[PDB]
Design a binder for this molecule. Sequence first.
Ligand code: CLA
Ligand code: CLA
Ligand code: CLA
Ligand SMILES: CC1=C(/C=C/C(C)=C/C=C/C(C)=C/C=C/C=C(C)/C=C/C=C(C)/C=C/C2=C(C)CCCC2(C)C)C(C)(C)CCC1
Ligand SMILES: CC1=C(C/C=C(\C)CCC[C@H](C)CCC[C@H](C)CCCC(C)C)C(=O)c2ccccc2C1=O
Ligand code: SF4
Ligand code: SF4
Ligand code: SF4
Lengths: 73, 739, 140, 80, 61, 43
Amino acid sequence: EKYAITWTSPKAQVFELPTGGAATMHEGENLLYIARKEYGIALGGQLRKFKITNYKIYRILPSGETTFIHPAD
Amino acid sequence: RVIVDKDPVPTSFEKWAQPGHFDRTLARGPKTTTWIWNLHALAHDFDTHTSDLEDISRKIFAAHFGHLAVVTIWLSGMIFHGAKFSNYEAWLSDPLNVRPSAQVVWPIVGQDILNGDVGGGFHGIQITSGLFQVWRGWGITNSFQLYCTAIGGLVLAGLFLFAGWFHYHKRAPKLEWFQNVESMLNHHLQVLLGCGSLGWAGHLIHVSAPINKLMDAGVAVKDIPLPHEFILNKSLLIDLFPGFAAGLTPFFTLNWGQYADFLTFKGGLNPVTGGLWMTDIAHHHLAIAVVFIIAGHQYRTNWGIGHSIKEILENHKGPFTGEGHKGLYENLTTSWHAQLATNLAFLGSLTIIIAHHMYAMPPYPYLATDYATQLCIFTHHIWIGGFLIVGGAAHAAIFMVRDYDPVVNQNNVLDRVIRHRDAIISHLNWVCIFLGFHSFGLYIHNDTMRALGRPQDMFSDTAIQLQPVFAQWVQNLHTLAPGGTAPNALEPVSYAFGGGVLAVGGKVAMMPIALGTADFLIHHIHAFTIHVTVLILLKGVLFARSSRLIPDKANLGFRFPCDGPGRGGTCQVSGWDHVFLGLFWMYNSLSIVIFHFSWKMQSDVWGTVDAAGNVSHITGGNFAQSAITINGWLRDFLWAQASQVINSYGSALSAYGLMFLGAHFVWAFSLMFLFSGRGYWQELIESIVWAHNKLKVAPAIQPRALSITQGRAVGVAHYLLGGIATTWAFFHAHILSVG
Amino acid sequence: GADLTPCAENPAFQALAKNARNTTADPQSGQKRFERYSQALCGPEGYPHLIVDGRLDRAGDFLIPSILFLYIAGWIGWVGRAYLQAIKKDSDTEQKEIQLDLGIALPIIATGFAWPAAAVKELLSGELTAKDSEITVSPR
Amino acid sequence: SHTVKIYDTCIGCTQCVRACPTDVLEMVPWDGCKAAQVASSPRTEDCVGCKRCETACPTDFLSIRVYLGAETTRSMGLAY
Amino acid sequence: VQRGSKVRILRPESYWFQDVGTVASVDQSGIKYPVIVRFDKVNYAGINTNNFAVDELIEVE
Amino acid sequence: DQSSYLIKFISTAPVAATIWLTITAGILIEFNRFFPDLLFHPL
Ligand code: CLA
Ligand code: CLA
Ligand code: CLA
Ligand SMILES: CC1=C(/C=C/C(C)=C/C=C/C(C)=C/C=C/C=C(C)/C=C/C=C(C)/C=C/C2=C(C)CCCC2(C)C)C(C)(C)CCC1
Ligand SMILES: CC1=C(C/C=C(\C)CCC[C@H](C)CCC[C@H](C)CCCC(C)C)C(=O)c2ccccc2C1=O
Ligand code: SF4
Ligand code: SF4
Ligand code: SF4
């Protein structure tokens, strides 16, 4: 696994997974393990129509290192 | 529940003046020549404008009256051209010798040589569309019945064109009139199909089959009475069809066996015409009609009783498929492309079934007699059926981009094919590869074994059998069905399975088609070229919204060229481009179906019967040992049968000689668009705009090269046009000479 | 050469004269082209071989249609040139390209027959061409 | 990876930052232009060569340019 | 120059090289290319405006 | 004025070029019914 993306949702609603297909986010903090960073921004723009701008893409190395790479601040 | 808006759109010539009024971006005026092509491209795309489904649906229903007018103008034109400019009254006296002809050519530039002698003192182009078989099958005897039909068609073409004005510019329906799909299916299955075939069943019994029975006796053409005298003078419906004096009461006392003279179940071909029995078609379209009027009482309307489609689909769900068919009602009652994908992949697949069910069971008088007609009716509706299946695949990919909704389509069977779409494609990728080696490589095996002088190592009828056991068996069941599993028949459903040879004059109407080793290979070539076509079209449907390469492909659109040179290169990733690649394989698949047809029927069906019953075929019976090698498909089919199309100068087949070469040109011309790219041609125009800037002939609308998507679209339209027209001009000039 | 003896003397051109095909429904359009083609030069095949040299006994092949074409072809360029000169000094000029200003296009069409008298006038005045400092060019 | 050069002619339109799908680009303040910010590419090891950033830039000629270089796993766009 | 002055372009990489523009607005301090020139014909991107330096232009009015 | 929209429609690109190329093609056709086979000028 690599590049975890987390976001906080106000409620539950059906979104579209970048890997193809539709899932249902929880209310509160979510977590999705994707393959590449290109999925997380293509998902992060799909959150923008849900009025969510609190998404954080990590970088999970196989050693266990999790590097916060989006945003920079 | 009819609610209709009153005058939405004013009828005016205002918007005819400015072009491209429909789109807000495109109406501001042209700046380059890109605007000229986007006007003709975004023209009949009514969905891009608004989100108002009520406003779009009124444009769609009114334009559908526009296409009904141009079909009726076309159809009444073919009757009118067959009324004046034809030899229909000389064809009825001798269909065995007089060739079907219309379209007399004006004599100006020496093209009067195209008006060749077809027989009957008449000079014109020998038609192959088979309208003389239809008009005799309708029972038309003289020219005046063709005039009043064609003049009647021109009136009926005017009512469709008036109602298209009326139901849009004057009285347009609301939205909820369109979404009464339970109320639509009840009227369209009963009144259109059921009552249409019940009324036509009344036309064979009272009119057509009395005339076609007097024709088979060989009485005359003029001496046969007018078909309204068959209704008045009932004594002529009792000389023929003796089960008619009992009248109307055996219908209502359930004495339906009284009607056994003119609602028969003969089950075979008429030995005089080589067509179907007219009494069997009468009992067909009547029994067709009862089933449709019953089954159109199914769906619920204003009176409570009836099924509901939102309650049929949501019950059918299983353990494997989760919520099942729950949610597919809202896809098919809101989106117009979901309807257009469904009504076109299943009407295009229907058209191919019509082509197979008309060469073996010729439904018209003297249809199987004319080899030139029967070859061309098959090969016509083959191509018409194949374009629509690609269109159903096209407008399904458009559904996935614009009209797909995640909220409705949650965990239903549409959602569950996008989870395992990698398992669908990669298991389909294997079968396309598996069928590629084990069907085409058995031709490459046979090419090499015959070239190496090893004929005993080939997959032929002599050396290594590959006999089609599962289709030789089904022919033996359909041969033995009269007396057995269908005792009421006499001969089989057709003579293509078994039975005997039915000769009409000298020419074979239908002979039992024997399947062998060459027929095993070519039916598995067909399964190969169809599964590959499905592979390309379904990949454009499943990967329409995203893939592992592009996670946001639906953000870009249905029709975009690429996503740049990165990721190795992402050109032709769109859902449009998989429709583009499937048009070639559709062309590839259907060209072999019409080549299998045009050489199996000539080698093993068609020909002349001698006195003792010996059947002398056209090509002498060489499909068996030559349709197993690619040399044999080149020598004995493409090379040997083209000796009538290229030797046809100075004769009436000269236009097929010119369309044979002229279509080789347009095919080769299309490769300039397919192979090259846009960015070359934009650079070249910059050096031609310079010489146009120098002499002050600089155009205000700037020249641009064709766009990336359009350069592909021009290159496939000129490809399919020249490739089919080659075959169009090759089938005609071969079969208008040996037939 | 090769064997360009005139068509009136040929056994081959007279053999092609006996099986004439009527061009138009005129019943002697088959005959009224072979007597017209007798002054041309038929080779060994029996077909008139045109001479584009410029010889005045053979002016009908190429010399006469060349003046006839270049009057009509330099017309269509000059009409299409002088219209685009006019519309550039207007309000929009892109509407008048696809949607023809018929009030302006029709005086230009009637004007044309002194285009050799106008093109030479435009040539000597230096208003035929444009300056190379005023045309866009590609970076070298 | 690839190479993203940003010249000094852009206007701070923020159309190239809102188009690069791997988020290579970001705006830094810069007292030159009218909008007082220039695009910058501090994360060019993530760039996939998409050239969406060159398509969205207004200025003629382009202030941003992607030079296609050596292609590692992140720039090939491989999920495997 | 001023709002309405026809100028010419000498930037070779630009699309409207040696073509006649029309100055729409001139800025005061920054960018180094402070002259907005509203052209009349469009480039391949479809736009018809650009920024240019002060010494880049050739006034023709 | 409804009539001005018909002059303005008859002078668009495909409509004018359909009529003008029909008059052009009809001149070549009716010249060739009456004077056919004109390979060269007869002098
Ligand atoms: C029931 C029939 C039907 C209907 C109503 C539609 C309707 C539509 N289609 Mg569709 N389609 C169909 C069948 C149909 N299609 C079939 C059978 C195919 C497979 C080939 C397609 C493939 C297809 C694609 C790939 C696309 C559409 C698109 C569209 C939309 C806009 C089309 C448009 O404006 O074209 C305007 C008309 C033209 C551009 C003219 C095209 C002319 C063709 C290429 C040449 C015809 C050759 C002709 C027979 C020979 C002429 C010879 C010449 C010498 C005169 C519209 C909703 C487009 C879209 O974006 O949808 C939203 C789109 O991208 N369709
Ligand atoms: C004659 C030309 C030709 C050939 C051979 C192929 C071959 C193929 N195309 Mg293809 N294609 C072509 C033209 C051709 N295409 C054109 C013109 C287009 C343009 C539209 C396309 C578009 C296209 C698409 C869009 C797709 C294909 C697909 C396929 C594959 C189908 C699987 C298959 O049958 O492989 C089996 C191989 C053969 C039938 C070739 C015969 C090989 C023999 C039997 C064995 C080799 C002999 C010997 C052992 C060699 C070794 C000798 C040693 C000394 C080295 C295959 C690679 C599809 C694909 O890849 O998915 C499956 C696919 O999606 N093609
Ligand atoms: C106003 C009309 C016009 C005029 C005067 C010229 C003049 C010229 N063109 Mg050009 N051209 C035009 C229209 C015109 N072009 C159009 C519409 C096209 C697109 C098809 C081209 C495509 C083109 C190419 C590709 C090339 C030229 C070239 C040339 C030069 C040599 C002549 C030649 O080869 O003819 C070329 C003619 C054609 C290719 C076809 C002619 C186009 C139509 C048939 C004529 C236009 C008539 C116009 C629509 C009438 C409008 C009337 C108005 C009142 C409404 C010369 C500068 C050549 C060059 O650079 O040489 C140095 C060259 O390579 N032109
Ligand atoms: C060819 C053509 C044409 C013509 C057509 C026609 C001629 C039509 C007709 C039509 C008709 C002529 C129809 C009919 C129909 C009928 C029906 C539809 C009937 C029904 C009935 C019923 C339903 C009955 C029943 C009943 C009984 C029996 C008893 C009890 C009661 C009741 C009433 C229920 C046209 C012109 C278009 C043109 C194109 C082509
Ligand atoms: C040749 C070619 C071109 C250039 C071809 C063009 C532009 C075709 C245009 C030719 C027609 C004739 C232009 C018509 C212009 C006027 C309508 C001509 C006036 C004539 C009328 C009076 C009939 C591309 O733009 C292109 C784009 C993408 C992939 C491949 C290719 C490609 O192969
Ligand atoms: S279509 Fe052309 S521009 Fe687009 S990615 Fe492919 S090669 Fe590059
Ligand atoms: S490079 Fe392009 S997108 Fe980025 S600031 Fe400059 S003009 Fe704007
Ligand atoms: S390579 Fe181009 S498209 Fe990809 S992120 Fe960088 S600037 Fe954007």
